[PDB]
Amino acid sequence: IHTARLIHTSDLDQETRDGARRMVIEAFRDPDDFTDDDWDHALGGMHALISHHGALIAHGAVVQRRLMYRGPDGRGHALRCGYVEAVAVREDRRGDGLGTAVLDALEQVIRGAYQIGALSASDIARPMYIARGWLSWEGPTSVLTPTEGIVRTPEDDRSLFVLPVDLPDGLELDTAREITCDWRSGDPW
Amino acid sequence: HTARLIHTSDLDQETRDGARRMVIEAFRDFTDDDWDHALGGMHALISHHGALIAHGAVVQRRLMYRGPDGRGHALRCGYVEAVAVREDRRGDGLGTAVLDALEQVIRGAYQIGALSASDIARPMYIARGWLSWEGPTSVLTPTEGIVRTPEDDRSLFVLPVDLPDGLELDTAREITCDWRSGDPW
Numbered sequence A: 001i002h003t004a005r006l007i008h009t010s011d012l013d014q015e016t017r018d019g020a021r022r023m024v025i026e027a028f029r030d031p032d033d034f035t036d037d038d039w040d041h042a043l044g045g046m047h048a049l050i051s052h053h054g055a056l057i058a059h060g061a062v063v064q065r066r067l068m069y070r071g072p073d074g075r076g077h078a079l080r081c082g083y084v085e086a087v088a089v090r091e092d093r094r095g096d097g098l099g100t101a102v103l104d105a106l107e108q109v110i111r112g113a114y115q116i117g118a119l120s121a122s123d124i125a126r127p128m129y130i131a132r133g134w135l136s137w138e139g140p141t142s143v144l145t146p147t148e149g150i151v152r153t154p155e156d157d158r159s160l161f162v163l164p165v166d167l168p169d170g171l172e173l174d175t176a177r178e179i180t181c182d183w184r185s186g187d188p189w
Numbered sequence B: 001h002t003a004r005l006i007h008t009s010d011l012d013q014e015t016r017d018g019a020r021r022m023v024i025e026a027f028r029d030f031t032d033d034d035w036d037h038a039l040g041g042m043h044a045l046i047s048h049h050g051a052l053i054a055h056g057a058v059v060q061r062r063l064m065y066r067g068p069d070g071r072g073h074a075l076r077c078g079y080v081e082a083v084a085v086r087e088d089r090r091g092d093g094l095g096t097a098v099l100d101a102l103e104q105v106i107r108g109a110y111q112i113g114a115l116s117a118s119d120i121a122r123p124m125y126i127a128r129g130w131l132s133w134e135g136p137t138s139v140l141t142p143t144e145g146i147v148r149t150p151e152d153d154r155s156l157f158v159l160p161v162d163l164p165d166g167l168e169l170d171t172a173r174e175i176t177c178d179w180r181s182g183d184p185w
Ligand SMILES: CC(C)(COP(=O)(O)OP(=O)(O)OC[C@H]1O[C@@H](n2cnc3c(N)ncnc32)[C@H](O)[C@@H]1OP(=O)(O)O)[C@@H](O)C(=O)NCCC(=O)NCCS
Pocket: A027, A028, A086, A087, A088, A089, A090, A093, A094, A095, A096, A097, A098, A099, A100, A101, A119, A120, A121, A122, A124, A125, A127, A128, A129, A131
């Protein structure tokens, strides 16, 4: 049985922070890339950590952002989103449920503080999100840019997963419709 | 005089409702959207015997800033919200202890802190290290473009903690926040 500890970015010491960052980059690389924008995107919220003999073996982070969604009534909602980033298990420790343990903890943050969880999954982790009941987003994805308007993001079109936990009053989320993230540098999703 | 720091996700329901009520009572108007804006980040709590007497929150947003090259930056921002102290206990430094714990989150976790405050708190914030934002402000809206936020009596303060790629801020230029319903700032 595995249990990740949850800890805010502000409570991570330099050592653990640099270590987490180096573990996640290693897990994603195979000697597309995990860049410093990808790491920056994982900062600011709650980290889930599992370590062994002082070494991080599993990491995940949930940060706040806004997801824009417009229903068929043409209204418009800016939902408080718990966005999951930098989920990773050290290669040699994979296949034993550490990844499940990270997501268990992050989902606890999502359900307790956000209206919706979302992420853009790597191909190897999609099965994990399906089995946990995340909803694959089927409509076009877009990003709200500063200077153009809402711009389509075709590279992200079949990778988004959502987890509606606390949608306002009577909002029905139609996965067939468009969805739009707020602006950031690097990959918007 | 030391406030404790708890993420929204670990607040039980009584604490949440208590904090919502206490902050409403302090603002004697705090709208329901104003409360939603306080949710999802770290709450600074000071309580006595089960009674919440000071609160504050810092939530994660993005502030857009354009340099002299036109290159744009979407800074990771810790936005201070719903700082309030029980009316009968003001003047004792609780508000300042709440600001202390929240600047700790900002320093540990964000590139920049930001808050909107009246000109009456302007000397304390300047004192505490915060820069007054003299330039224009706006919000990146979903259906229109970047729309100028009209001036009110509150002014915007930023706390440059950890600016990326050695960027230096020119408080005279534009700063625009990300979208949310209710008051964008
Ligand atoms: C994705 C990753 C974190 C998975 O970690 P892991 O510890 O091996 O995962 P777990 O052992 O906890 O597997 C959890 C569940 O995911 C699902 N799963 C993962 N791969 C699966 C597969 N090929 N077939 C079926 N289910 C699969 C399963 O339901 C599994 O439960 P199960 O094995 O009992 O069926 C890991 O491979 C990794 O670090 N990859 C690098 C790429 C990356 O970081 N992606 C981030 C995902 S957004």
